[PDB]
Amino acid sequence: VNSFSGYLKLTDNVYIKNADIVEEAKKVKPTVVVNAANVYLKHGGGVAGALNKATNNAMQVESDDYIATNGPLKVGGSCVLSGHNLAKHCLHVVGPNVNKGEDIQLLKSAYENFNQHEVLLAPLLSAGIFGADPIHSLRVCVDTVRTNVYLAVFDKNLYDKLVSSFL
């Protein structure tokens, strides 16, 4: 469990690696993998689609069942579901959809959900299709998360820009 390796330490509790979060989950066997979700847990692409594909669609079946019973999440909110074959648990976190006008301050609330877990494998919330500036998402993560977060950044150019901008 939690076999993290090859990360660059950014702060006392935030680590970063240029990697596909799916390949990391398979190597690391984390207690918790974070999904960058929407409020309906419809895992249509990005991190969410990659995680769902790696669970052979079991994540989407489980998510549909949960939402049908319980209703949508709130923006900035989260829910723990099974991690299936990738992790013990998946923490589905809804960052704000900045491009659609949702309040970017909810990125703080989104990252605050990480603090209920001692160690997490995670992506940069809202930094893809939701349109938040990745450097900003990293800054909010560093300022908000107090537990141990291992960030997987798939794109090499972005990873280099994030590490350069942080260094």
Ligand SMILES: CO[C@H]1O[C@H](COP(=O)(O)OP(=O)(O)OC[C@H]2O[C@@H](n3cnc4c(N)ncnc43)[C@H](O)[C@@H]2O)[C@@H](O)[C@H]1O
């Ligand atoms: C389309 O629907 C989905 O996207 C919506 C949520 O959008 P988001 O902006 O919060 O998250 P996204 O996943 O787009 O990117 C977050 C960050 O992870 C990077 N990245 C992408 N794939 C990655 C991978 N396999 N491994 C590591 N890093 C990855 C991105 O380059 C970006 O920096 C929601 O509706 C959801 O169902």
